[PDB]
């Protein structure tokens, strides 16, 4: 197989259970690899911590929306 | 005087008194003109509303920080 199949893959095996204050969240990425066990987002905090969260949770979608908006408005 | 002195100036005469949820706030600008009566920030919400706030308030500085970070990290 190509050497792309032996690249390591980052997953979320667990998702945070407490909501995190949105002013803490600075960015997010999505888990996309089918090898991973669950659909999830990884938030990057101000501090640089990485947090797995369930995009089905309300706060999570709301934080994702908030960051999306700004990103599309921040170009500048 | 130059025609710059007869340009209209936007100010904040009042500042919001209730805290606004940070996921609502998408951007901010500062009042800078000395003609204005008070130091303040103008937040732009998701919805496009404009809100005057007092940068001495905790939530406000925190929202400003949050947006600053992302802006400097969002270039991309």
List the domain boundaries for chain B.
2-76
Which residues between 47 and 66 in chain B have a beta carbon less than 8 angstroms from any beta carbon of chain A?
Answer: 62-63, 65-66
Residue B64 near residue B41, CB atoms below 8 Å: yes
Residue B48, phi-psi category: left (phi > 0), alpha (psi -120 to 50), beta (remainder)? left
Is the minimum CB–CB distance between A27 and chain B shorter than 8 Å? yes
Is the minimum CB–CB distance between B5 and chain A shorter than 8 Å? no
Cα separation, B25 vs B46, whole angstroms: 6
Residue A33 near residue A11, CB atoms below 8 Å: yes
Find the CB nearest A23 among B27, B66, B74: B66
Structure tokens at B68: 């600053």
What is the structure's resolution, reported in angstroms to one decimal?
2.0
Tell whether domain A2-76 is in CATH 2.40.50.40.
yes
Query: Which helix (H) or strand (E) element contains residue A45?
Result: strand A41-45
User: How close A1 gets to chain B, by Cα (Å)?
Assistant: 33
Only one residue has tokens 């501090």, namely A47
Neighbours of B8 (CB within 10 A): 4
Q: Which of A20, A12, A33, A24 minimizes the C-alpha distance to A60?
A: A20
Classified as helix, coil or strand, B55 is coil
């Amino acid at each position: 197989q190509p050497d792309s199949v032996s690249i390591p893959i980052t997953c979320c095996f667990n998702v945070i259970n407490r909501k995190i204050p949105i002013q803490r969240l600075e960015s997010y990425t999505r888990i996309t690899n089918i090898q991973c066990p669950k659909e999830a987002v990884i938030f990057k905090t101000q501090r640089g911590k990485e947090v797995c969260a369930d995009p089905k949770e309300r706060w999570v979608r709301d934080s994702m929306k908030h960051l999306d908006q700004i990103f599309q408005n921040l170009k500048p």
